[PDB]
Coordinates of N, CA, C and O in Angstrom, one line a residue:
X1 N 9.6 19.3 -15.5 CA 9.5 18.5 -14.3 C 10.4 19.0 -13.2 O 11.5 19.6 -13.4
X2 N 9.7 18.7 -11.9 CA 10.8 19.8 -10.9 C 11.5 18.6 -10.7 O 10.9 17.5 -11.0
X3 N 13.3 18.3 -10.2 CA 14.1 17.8 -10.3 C 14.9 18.2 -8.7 O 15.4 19.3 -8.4
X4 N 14.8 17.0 -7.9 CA 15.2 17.2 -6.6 C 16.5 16.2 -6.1 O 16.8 15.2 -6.8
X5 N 17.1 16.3 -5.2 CA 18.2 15.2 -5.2 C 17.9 14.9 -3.7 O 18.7 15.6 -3.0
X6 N 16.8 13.8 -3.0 CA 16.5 13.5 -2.3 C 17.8 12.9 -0.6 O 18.6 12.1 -0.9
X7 N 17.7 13.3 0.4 CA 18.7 12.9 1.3 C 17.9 12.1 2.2 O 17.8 10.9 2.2
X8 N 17.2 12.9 2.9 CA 16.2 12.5 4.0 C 15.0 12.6 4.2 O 14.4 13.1 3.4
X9 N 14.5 12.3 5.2 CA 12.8 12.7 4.7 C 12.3 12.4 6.5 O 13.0 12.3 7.5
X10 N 11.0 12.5 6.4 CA 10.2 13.1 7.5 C 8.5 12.2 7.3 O 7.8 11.8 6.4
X11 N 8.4 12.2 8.3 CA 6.7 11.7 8.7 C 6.1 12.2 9.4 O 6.2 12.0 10.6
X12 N 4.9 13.2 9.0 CA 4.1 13.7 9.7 C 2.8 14.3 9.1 O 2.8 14.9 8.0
X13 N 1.4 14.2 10.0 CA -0.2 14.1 9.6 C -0.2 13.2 8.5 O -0.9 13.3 7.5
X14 N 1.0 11.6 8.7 CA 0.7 10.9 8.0 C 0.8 10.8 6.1 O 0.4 10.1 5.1
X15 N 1.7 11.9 6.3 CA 2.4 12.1 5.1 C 3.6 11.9 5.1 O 4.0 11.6 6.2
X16 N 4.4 11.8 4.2 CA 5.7 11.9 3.7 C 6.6 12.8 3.0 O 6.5 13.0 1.8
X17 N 7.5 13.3 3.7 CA 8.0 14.8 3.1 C 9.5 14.2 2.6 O 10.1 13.3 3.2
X18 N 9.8 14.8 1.5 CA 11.4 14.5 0.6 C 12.0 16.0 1.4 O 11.3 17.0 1.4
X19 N 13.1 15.9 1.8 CA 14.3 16.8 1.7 C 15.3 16.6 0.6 O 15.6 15.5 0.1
X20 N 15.8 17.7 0.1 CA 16.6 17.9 -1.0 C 17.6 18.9 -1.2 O 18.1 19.7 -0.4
X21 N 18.0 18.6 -2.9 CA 18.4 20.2 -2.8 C 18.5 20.3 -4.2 O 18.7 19.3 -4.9
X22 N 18.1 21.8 -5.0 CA 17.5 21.7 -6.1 C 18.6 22.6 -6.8 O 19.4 23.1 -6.0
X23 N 18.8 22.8 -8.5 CA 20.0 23.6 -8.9 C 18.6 25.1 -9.2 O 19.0 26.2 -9.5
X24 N 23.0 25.4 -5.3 CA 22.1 24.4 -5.6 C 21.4 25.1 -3.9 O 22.0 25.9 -3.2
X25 N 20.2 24.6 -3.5 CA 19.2 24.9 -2.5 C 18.2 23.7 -2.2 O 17.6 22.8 -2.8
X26 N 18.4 24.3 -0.8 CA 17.3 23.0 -0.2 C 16.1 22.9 -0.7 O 15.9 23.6 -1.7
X27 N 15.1 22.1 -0.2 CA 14.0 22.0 -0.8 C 13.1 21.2 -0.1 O 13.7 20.3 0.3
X28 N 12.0 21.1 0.2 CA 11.0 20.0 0.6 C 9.5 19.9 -0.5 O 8.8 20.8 -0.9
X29 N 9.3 18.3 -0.9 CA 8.5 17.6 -1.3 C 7.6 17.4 -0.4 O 8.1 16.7 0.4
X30 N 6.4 17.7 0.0 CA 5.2 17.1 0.8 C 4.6 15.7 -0.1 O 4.5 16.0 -1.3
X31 N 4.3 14.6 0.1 CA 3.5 13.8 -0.6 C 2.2 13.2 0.0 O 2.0 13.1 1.2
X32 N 1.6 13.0 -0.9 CA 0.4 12.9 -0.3 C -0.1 11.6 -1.5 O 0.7 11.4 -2.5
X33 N -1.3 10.7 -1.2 CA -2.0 10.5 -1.8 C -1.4 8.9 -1.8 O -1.9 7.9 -2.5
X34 N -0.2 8.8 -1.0 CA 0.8 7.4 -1.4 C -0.1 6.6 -0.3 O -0.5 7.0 0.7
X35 N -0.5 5.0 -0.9 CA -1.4 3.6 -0.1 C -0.7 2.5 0.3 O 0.3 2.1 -0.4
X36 N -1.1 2.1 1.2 CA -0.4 0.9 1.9 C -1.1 0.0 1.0 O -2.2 0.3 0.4
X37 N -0.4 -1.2 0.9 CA -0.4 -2.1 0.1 C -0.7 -3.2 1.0 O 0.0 -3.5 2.0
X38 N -2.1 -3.9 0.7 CA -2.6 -4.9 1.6 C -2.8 -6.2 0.9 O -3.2 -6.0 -0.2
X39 N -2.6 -7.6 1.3 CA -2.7 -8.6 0.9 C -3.6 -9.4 1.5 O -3.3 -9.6 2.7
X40 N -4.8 -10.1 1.0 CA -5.1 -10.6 1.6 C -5.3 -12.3 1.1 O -5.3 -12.4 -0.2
X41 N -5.3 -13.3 1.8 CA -5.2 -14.5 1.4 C -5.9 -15.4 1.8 O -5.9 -16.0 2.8
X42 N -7.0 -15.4 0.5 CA -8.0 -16.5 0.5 C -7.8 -17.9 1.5 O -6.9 -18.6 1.9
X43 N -9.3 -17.8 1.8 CA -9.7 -19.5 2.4 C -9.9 -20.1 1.4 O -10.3 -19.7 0.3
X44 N -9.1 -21.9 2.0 CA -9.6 -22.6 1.0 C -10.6 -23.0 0.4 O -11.6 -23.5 0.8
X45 N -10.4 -22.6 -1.0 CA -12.1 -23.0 -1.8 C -13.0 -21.7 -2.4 O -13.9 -21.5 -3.1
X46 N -12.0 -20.6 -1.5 CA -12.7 -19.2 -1.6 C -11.6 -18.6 -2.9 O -10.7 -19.1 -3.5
X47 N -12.3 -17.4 -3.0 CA -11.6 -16.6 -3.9 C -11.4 -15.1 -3.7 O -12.1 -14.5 -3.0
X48 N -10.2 -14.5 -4.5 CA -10.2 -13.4 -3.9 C -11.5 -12.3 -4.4 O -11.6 -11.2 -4.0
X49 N -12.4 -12.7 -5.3 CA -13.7 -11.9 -5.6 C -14.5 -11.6 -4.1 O -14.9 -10.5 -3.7
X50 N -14.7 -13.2 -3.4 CA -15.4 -13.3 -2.2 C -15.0 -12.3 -1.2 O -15.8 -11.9 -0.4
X51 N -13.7 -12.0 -1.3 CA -13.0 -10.8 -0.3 C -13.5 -9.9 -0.3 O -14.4 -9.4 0.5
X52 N -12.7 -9.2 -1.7 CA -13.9 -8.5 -2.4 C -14.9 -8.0 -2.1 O -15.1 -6.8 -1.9
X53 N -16.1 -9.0 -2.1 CA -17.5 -9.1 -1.6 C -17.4 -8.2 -0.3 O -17.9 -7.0 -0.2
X54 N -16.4 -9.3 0.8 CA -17.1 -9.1 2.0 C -16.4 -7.6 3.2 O -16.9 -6.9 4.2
X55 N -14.9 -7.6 2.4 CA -14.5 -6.5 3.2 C -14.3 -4.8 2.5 O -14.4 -3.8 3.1
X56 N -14.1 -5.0 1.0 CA -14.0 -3.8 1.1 C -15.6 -2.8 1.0 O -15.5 -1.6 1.1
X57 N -16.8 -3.4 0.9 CA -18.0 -2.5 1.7 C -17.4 -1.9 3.3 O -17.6 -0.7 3.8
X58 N -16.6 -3.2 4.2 CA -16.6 -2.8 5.1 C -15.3 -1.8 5.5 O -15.5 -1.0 6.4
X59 N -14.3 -1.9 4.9 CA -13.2 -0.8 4.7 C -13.9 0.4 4.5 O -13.7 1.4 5.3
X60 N -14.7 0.6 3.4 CA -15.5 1.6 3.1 C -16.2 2.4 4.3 O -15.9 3.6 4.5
X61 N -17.1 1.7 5.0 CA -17.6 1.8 6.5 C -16.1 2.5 7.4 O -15.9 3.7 7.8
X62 N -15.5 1.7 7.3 CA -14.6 2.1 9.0 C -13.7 3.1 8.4 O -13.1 3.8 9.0
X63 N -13.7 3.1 7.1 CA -12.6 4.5 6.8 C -13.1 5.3 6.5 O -12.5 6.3 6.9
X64 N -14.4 5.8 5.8 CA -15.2 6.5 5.3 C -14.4 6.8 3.7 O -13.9 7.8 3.1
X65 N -14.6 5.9 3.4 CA -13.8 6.1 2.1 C -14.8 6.0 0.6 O -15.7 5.3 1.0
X66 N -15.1 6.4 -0.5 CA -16.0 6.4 -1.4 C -15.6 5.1 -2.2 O -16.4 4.2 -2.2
X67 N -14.7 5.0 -2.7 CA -14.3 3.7 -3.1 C -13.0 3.4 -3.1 O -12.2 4.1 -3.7
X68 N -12.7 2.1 -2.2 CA -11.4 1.7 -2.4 C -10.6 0.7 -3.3 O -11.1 -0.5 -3.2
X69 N -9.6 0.8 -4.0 CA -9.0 -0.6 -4.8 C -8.3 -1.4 -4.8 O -7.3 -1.2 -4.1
X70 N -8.5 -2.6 -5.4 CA -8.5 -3.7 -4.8 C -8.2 -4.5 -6.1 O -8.3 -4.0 -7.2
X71 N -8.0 -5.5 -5.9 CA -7.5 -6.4 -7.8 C -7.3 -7.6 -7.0 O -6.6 -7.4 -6.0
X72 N -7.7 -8.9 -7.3 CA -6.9 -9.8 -7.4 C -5.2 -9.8 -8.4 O -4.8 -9.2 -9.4
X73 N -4.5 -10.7 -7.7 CA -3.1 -10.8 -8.0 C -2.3 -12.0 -7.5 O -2.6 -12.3 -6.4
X74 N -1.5 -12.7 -7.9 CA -0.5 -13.8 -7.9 C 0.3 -13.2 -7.2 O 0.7 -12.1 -7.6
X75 N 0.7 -13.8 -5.7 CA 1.7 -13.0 -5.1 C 2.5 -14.9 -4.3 O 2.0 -16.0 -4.2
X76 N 3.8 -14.5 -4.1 CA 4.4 -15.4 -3.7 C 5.0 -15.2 -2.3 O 5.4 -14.2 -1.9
X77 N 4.9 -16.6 -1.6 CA 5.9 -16.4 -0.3 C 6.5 -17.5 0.1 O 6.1 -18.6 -0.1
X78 N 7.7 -17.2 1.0 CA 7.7 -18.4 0.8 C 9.3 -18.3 2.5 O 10.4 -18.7 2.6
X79 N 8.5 -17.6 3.3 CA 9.0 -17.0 4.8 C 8.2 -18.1 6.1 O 7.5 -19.1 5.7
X80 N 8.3 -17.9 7.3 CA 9.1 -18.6 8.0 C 7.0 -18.9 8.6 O 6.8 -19.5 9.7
X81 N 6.2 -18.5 8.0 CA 4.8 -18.4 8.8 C 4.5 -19.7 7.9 O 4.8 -19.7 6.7
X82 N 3.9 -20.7 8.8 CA 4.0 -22.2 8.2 C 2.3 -22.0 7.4 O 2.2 -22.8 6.4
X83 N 1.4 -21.2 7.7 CA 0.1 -21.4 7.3 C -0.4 -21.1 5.9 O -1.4 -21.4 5.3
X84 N 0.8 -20.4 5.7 CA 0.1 -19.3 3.9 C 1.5 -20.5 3.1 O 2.6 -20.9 3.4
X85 N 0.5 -20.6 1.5 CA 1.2 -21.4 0.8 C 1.9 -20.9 0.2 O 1.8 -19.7 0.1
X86 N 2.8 -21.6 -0.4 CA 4.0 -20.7 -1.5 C 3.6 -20.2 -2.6 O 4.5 -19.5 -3.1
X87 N 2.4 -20.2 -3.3 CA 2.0 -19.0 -4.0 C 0.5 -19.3 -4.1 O 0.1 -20.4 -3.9
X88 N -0.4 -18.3 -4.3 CA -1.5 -18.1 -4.5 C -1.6 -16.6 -4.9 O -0.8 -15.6 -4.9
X89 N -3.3 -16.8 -5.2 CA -4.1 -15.5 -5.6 C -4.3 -14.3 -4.3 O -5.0 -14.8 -3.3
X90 N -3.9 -13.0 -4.1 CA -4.1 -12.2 -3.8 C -4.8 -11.1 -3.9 O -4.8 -10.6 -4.9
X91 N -5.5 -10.5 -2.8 CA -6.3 -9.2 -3.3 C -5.6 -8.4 -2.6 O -5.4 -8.1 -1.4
X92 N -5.1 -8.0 -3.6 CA -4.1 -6.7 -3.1 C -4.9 -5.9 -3.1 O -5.7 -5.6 -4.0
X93 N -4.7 -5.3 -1.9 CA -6.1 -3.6 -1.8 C -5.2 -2.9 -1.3 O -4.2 -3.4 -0.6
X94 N -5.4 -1.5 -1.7 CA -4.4 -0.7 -1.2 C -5.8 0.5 -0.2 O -6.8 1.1 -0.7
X95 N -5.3 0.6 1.1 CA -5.8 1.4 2.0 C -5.1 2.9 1.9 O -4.0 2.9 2.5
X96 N -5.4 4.1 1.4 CA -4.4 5.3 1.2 C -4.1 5.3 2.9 O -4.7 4.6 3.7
X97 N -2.8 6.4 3.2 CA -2.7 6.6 4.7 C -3.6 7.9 4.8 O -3.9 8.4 5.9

């Protein structure tokens, strides 16, 4: 396994690059392939399957993506936005960048 000792890093074409230094010499990591982590939070009565249903065809559409993933999940909160409850079901979808 290659073995780097990470300092700083970089953003660009929406990637993420590691600076380092390897046994000692610099080095750069390009990464690729890393997804934002999306939550979304059911209407009352609904479920995160119906989400599901309705947006990721449409994610599919506006990103051109073949298939994107998605799970329901138990997520908690419990911050200063009065409308979302202190815990419920989530569909965490993750959109790659």
């Amino acid at each position: 396994t290659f073995q780097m000792f990470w300092l700083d890093y970089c953003e660009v074409n929406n990637t993420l690059i590691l600076f380092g230094k390897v046994k000692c010499v610099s080095a750069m990591v390009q990464i690729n392939g890393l997804c934002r982590e999306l939550f979304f939070l059911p209407r009352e009565g609904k479920t995160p399957t119906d989400i599901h249903e309705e947006i990721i065809p449409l994610l599919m559409d506006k990103y051109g993506l073949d298939n994107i993933r998605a799970k329901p999940q138990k997520m908690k909160y419990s911050f200063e936005l009065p409308d979302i409850p202190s815990e419920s079901d989530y569909l965490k979808v993750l959109l790659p960048y």
